[PDB]
Amino acid sequence: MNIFEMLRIDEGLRLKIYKDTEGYYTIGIGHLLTKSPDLNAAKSELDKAIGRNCNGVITKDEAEKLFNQDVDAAVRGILRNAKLKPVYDSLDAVRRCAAINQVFQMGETGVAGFTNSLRMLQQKRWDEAAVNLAKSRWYNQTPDRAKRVITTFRTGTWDAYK
Numbered sequence: 001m002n003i004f005e006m007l008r009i010d011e012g013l014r015l016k017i018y019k020d021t022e023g024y025y026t027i028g029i030g031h032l033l034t035k036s037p038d039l040n041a042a043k044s045e046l047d048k049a050i051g052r053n054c055n056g057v058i059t060k061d062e063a064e065k066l067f068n069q070d071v072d073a074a075v076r077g078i079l080r081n082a083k084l085k086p087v088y089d090s091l092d093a094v095r096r097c098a099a100i101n102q103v104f105q106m107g108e109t110g111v112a113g114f115t116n117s118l119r120m121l122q123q124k125r126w127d128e129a130a131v132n133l134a135k136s137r138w139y140n141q142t143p144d145r146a147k148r149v150i151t152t153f154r155t156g157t158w159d160a161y162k
């Protein structure tokens with residue numbers, strides 16, 4: 001297991017524009033195109049992202065290319081965020097993957113409410129962190145995925161991903 005395999009499980013792979021769990025136009029391995037309800041705006045973002053006229057469909061290679069960029073962006077983002085970087089750098093490599101996963105799903109604004117979880121994670125209070133992480137819109141809206149990511153934070157193992 002690694003961050004790519006982990007996110008591939010959590011995000012799936014779809015080669016045609018689809019709506020994610022929040023109803024937003026998405027493609028590939030959880031590549032968010034736009035929060036706009038306009039399918040044409042999503043097709044425009046797709047064409048811009050890939051550099052050709054895709055008419056809402058891409059190849060596996062193109063999906064994986066966006067995925068590589070998106071994972072990279074998630075990590076570089078964390079490292080640029082003064083609240084996230086110190087916690088991320090305190091973690092072991094497995095728990096870092098849980099952090100990348102969460103930011104990939106939610107974005108940095110998405111994780112702004114996680115201040116108390118962040119402190120517990122930096123303190124290595126793993127069970128307490130795990131309890132706090134589940135008290136969230138995140139957990140309630142995507143419980144099966146959140147349970148996996150939380151188990152990863154709690155244990156520093158890949159047990160939740162088999």
Ligand SMILES: CCc1ccccc1O
Binds near residue numbers: 118
């Ligand atoms: C709250 C979990 C977490 C830890 C460290 C960095 C990002 C992140 O979302």
